[PDB]
Every structure is written in structure tokens, then in C-alpha cells.
Design a binder for these strands. Structure first.
Ligand SMILES: Nc1nc2c(ncn2[C@H]2C[C@H](O)[C@@H](COP(=O)(O)OP(=O)(O)OP(=O)(O)O)O2)c(=O)[nH]1
Ligand SMILES: *Nc1ccc2c(c1)Cc1ccccc1-2
Ligand SMILES: [Ca+2]
Ligand SMILES: [Ca+2]
Ligand SMILES: [Ca+2]
Length: 341
DNA sequence: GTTGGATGGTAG
DNA sequence: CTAACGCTACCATCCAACC
């Protein structure tokens, strides 16, 4: 059983460079502007040139501009990128039918019935890399391994513009040697709990007792880690099926004023219903981000589909509920539909 | 119990 | 106005419900 993982290089910045070859070689920062002040907002992604200087996803635009003022700042165009994204996701279909599209920029192919061994797998990788390079000018990074988690880890190790195999030998090796905080799904909070426990390596989960580990990092995460370490991890490549559409946005100034807030809430609903496209959701959630970035939400599930009209009235009763039950101002507001028929 | 909803935390 | 864009997926927990 063989899994090939593709993940596009600095994707949005790269699409801008292909849309503007002059930018190539020089720092490019794709950022969302917010409208609260001169350069309010955040960098969504930066090319590798930029990154060398500290400009990366999540930092304030006004900060990035401290560091790199001469650099090129470009407003995000999610729609332009999703189109390139989709063309690429179709080229990959041409190489395997069983494909798990994981994000705007990464997909898992199962290539078991296409290649005989990792050698042929590698070569297919090479071929995929060329094909996406020919037709879309984007460079990707490819990871090949026995399952999804380790094909991802391969890609993480190989990036910019690489291709890397992890054979059943090195899967065994990495279970013993890789920092457990590099295993997909293990972030800062989970890593600091595992260290306290004295678990630094995937193999260490077999030596600790299960109930004690459950106690710390939850059941789901426990099993996942154990399975990885036992070499039993074998979730299949399933087809992407969305469970949530949503859209939440940052207002021009903080407010508690229902009149000031609605136009945001309703532009949120219009885009969500538009993204839904034939999907009927049974549940709606209004989500507020307070003046100090704590996240608060309220919602409702109906026994039937939510019409756009019902979404309106309900989204306002939900927003009110928020303002009633929490007195902080509101910096971002938006909506999330779910539980589709 | 196992299930489902509301809300929230963690991750990518 | 004075820093923090925005997307989806999954799991944990508290807390009725339906036996
Ligand atoms: N707005 C926004 N988009 C993000 C963020 N993180 C990732 N993305 C989007 C934009 C990226 O171009 C796209 C793919 O990002 P990756 O996580 O795969 O890293 P990226 O491809 O941009 O550079 P790569 O060499 O992996 O690191 O996903 C983020 O914090 N904010
Ligand atoms: N707003 C936002 C935050 C994180 C991520 C996206 C959007 C898309 C994406 C893809 C892969 C990893 C992380 C993110
Ligand atoms: Ca990616
Ligand atoms: Ca990427
Ligand atoms: Ca990690």
C-alpha cells in the first residue's frame, strides 16, 4: 500500500509570481487588509525570500512593513488561487482516481494499483512534479510513504520543491527518532503535555500506560499516537466532503450596535449561502470575536433545512443572545452553517 | 450507558 | 485608529433525552 502526497510551495505568493514574473526573486507578501487603519490586517502568506527576514503567516502587516518596507504587498485574491488550485487538483486526478483533496493546496493520492514499489512511486512523483510545472508553472513538494501521516512528514522534511520517500525501514526508524511534536496533529499545547509526561518520541507511547495518557491528551489523540507507533496506522484515502461552510469578518471598528453590526452579519450570510450551492444546512452558528480576541458563539439546530430567510432572522436572535450574555465589544462577527442534508 | 446539541479548544 | 487576515475538521465536555 502506497500513498503519494502533494503540497504546493508558498502557494498564494507563488500564484502571484506566476501571474507576475517580475516579482520572482524578490520578497512577496500576500496580506488581507482590514480597513481599521493604515495597513491594519495580517499577512496570509509570504514567499521564501520574505520568510528569511521573519515575514510569515499571521504577523501584522504593519510589522512586516517594519522589517521589509521595500517588499511587495499584495491583497489576497482567494478566488484566483482556488482556480489554479482546481486545475492542479484535476491534473492529479489524471494520475490517480482515489484522491483526498485536503486543502486549497495539498492532496493525497493512493497509488497502490499504479506503481509496484517506492522506486516507481518516486518516478511518478518526478512525473507529477514536471506536469504541474509544465501546465501551471507552480512548484510542489512530494512525500511518498505507506500512509497519510508519514507521506505528510516526508513533505514537511523535503520542502521547497522536493520529493522524498519514507520506506518501511525509515518508518520504523522515525517511530523511534522523530520528535513527537513533528507528528501531524501535535501542536504546542499537546507537545508541552507530552513533555511533562516524558514522551518525546512516537515509540514512548507504547511504554506508557494507556489510561494515564488518555488522561492527559484525550482518547482520540492517544489512540492515533499508539497506532502510529504500532505501525498499524492505516486510515484510507477518503473523498473530501465538506461538513461546514462559514464566513466571519473583522469590522471597521469595535461595536455593540446591532445597526452597525448587521451589515457584516448579513454579508456573511450571503456569501455562505452562495458557497453552499445546493446544500441545505440544518444548523446555524453566529460567531463573535470580542475586542480582546476571545471567541464566543451561539447556535441552533433545526429538524429541517434552513432557508436563507430563516438564516437571517435566526442569525439576529443569535447575535442578540451574544450581546445579552457577554458585555465586551465585538471586533469580528460571522456565521457558520453545518449539518447538511 | 450511547446519543445528540451547544459551546469551546486544538490544529493545519 | 495605534497588532493579531481567515478557512475547515475533529474532539472534549457538560448536560438534557431517551430508553
Ligand atoms: N490567510 C491565511 N492563509 C493561510 C494560512 N496558512 C496557510 N494558508 C493558506 C495560504 C497558503 O498559500 C496555503 C498553503 O499554505 P501552507 O500551509 O501549505 O504553507 P505554504 O504553501 O503557503 O508555504 P509552504 O512552503 O508550505 O510553507 O494555505 C494563514 O495563516 N492564513
Ligand atoms: N484562515 C486560515 C488559517 C489557516 C489555514 C487556512 C486559512 C487555509 C489552510 C490550509 C492549510 C493549513 C492551514 C490553513
Ligand atoms: Ca499545504
Ligand atoms: Ca504548501
Ligand atoms: Ca507539531
Amino acid at each position: 500500500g502506497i500513498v503519494l502526497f502533494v503540497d504546493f510551495d508558498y502557494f498564494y505568493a507563488q500564484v502571484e509570481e506566476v501571474l507576475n514574473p517580475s516579482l520572482k526573486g524578490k520578497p512577496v507578501v500576500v496580506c488581507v487588509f482590514s480597513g481599521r487603519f493604515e495597513d491594519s490586517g495580517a499577512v496570509a502568506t509570504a514567499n521564501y525570500e520574505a520568510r528569511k527576514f521573519g515575514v510569515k503567516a499571521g504577523i501584522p502587516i504593519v510589522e512586516a512593513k517594519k522589517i521589509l518596507p521595500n517588499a511587495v504587498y499584495l491583497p489576497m485574491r482567494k478566488e484566483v488561487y482556488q482556480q489554479v488550485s482546481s486545475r492542479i487538483m484535476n491534473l492529479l486526478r489524471e494520475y490517480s482516481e482515489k484522491i483526498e483533496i485536503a486543502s486549497i493546496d495539498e492532496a493525497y493520492l493512493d497509488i497502490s494499483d499504479k506503481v509496484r514499489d517506492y522506486r516507481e512511486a518516486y518516478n511518478l512523483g518526478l512525473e507529477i512534479k514536471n506536469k504541474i510545472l509544465e501546465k501551471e508553472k507552480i512548484t510542489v513538494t512530494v512525500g511518498i510513504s505507506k500512509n497519510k501521516v508519514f507521506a505528510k512528514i516526508a513533505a514537511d522534511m523535503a520542502k521547497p520543491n522536493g520529493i522524498k520517500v519514507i520506506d518501511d525501514e525509515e518508518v520504523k526508524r522515525l517511530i523511534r527518532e522523530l520528535d513527537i511534536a513533528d507528528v501531524p496533529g501535535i501542536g504546542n499545547i499537546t507537545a508541552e503535555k507530552l513533555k511533562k509526561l516524558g514522551i518525546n518520541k512516537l515509540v514512548d507511547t507504547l511504554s506508557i500506560e494507556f489510561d494515564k495518557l488518555k488522561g492527559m491528551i484525550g482518547e482520540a489523540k492517544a489512540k492515533y499516537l499508539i497506532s502510529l507507533a504500532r505501525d498499524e496506522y492505516n486510515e484510507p484515502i477518503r473523498t473530501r466532503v465538506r461538513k461546514s461552510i462559514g464566513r466571519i469578518v473583522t469590522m471597521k471598528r469595535n461595536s455593540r450596535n446591532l445597526e452597525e453590526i448587521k451589515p457584516y452579519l448579513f454579508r456573511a450570510i450571503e456569501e455562505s449561502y452562495y458557497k453552499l450551492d445546493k446544500r441545505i444546512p440544518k444548523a446555524i452558528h453566529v460567531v463573535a470575536v470580542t475586542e480582546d480576541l476571545d471567541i464566543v458563539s451561539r447556535g441552533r439546530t433545526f429538524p429541517h433545512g434552513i432557508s436563507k430567510e430563516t438564516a437571517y432572522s435566526e442569525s439576529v436572535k443569535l447575535l442578540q443572545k451574544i450581546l445579552e450574555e457577554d458585555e465586551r465589544k465585538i471586533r469580528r462577527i460571522g456565521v457558520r452553517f453545518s449539518k447538511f442534508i
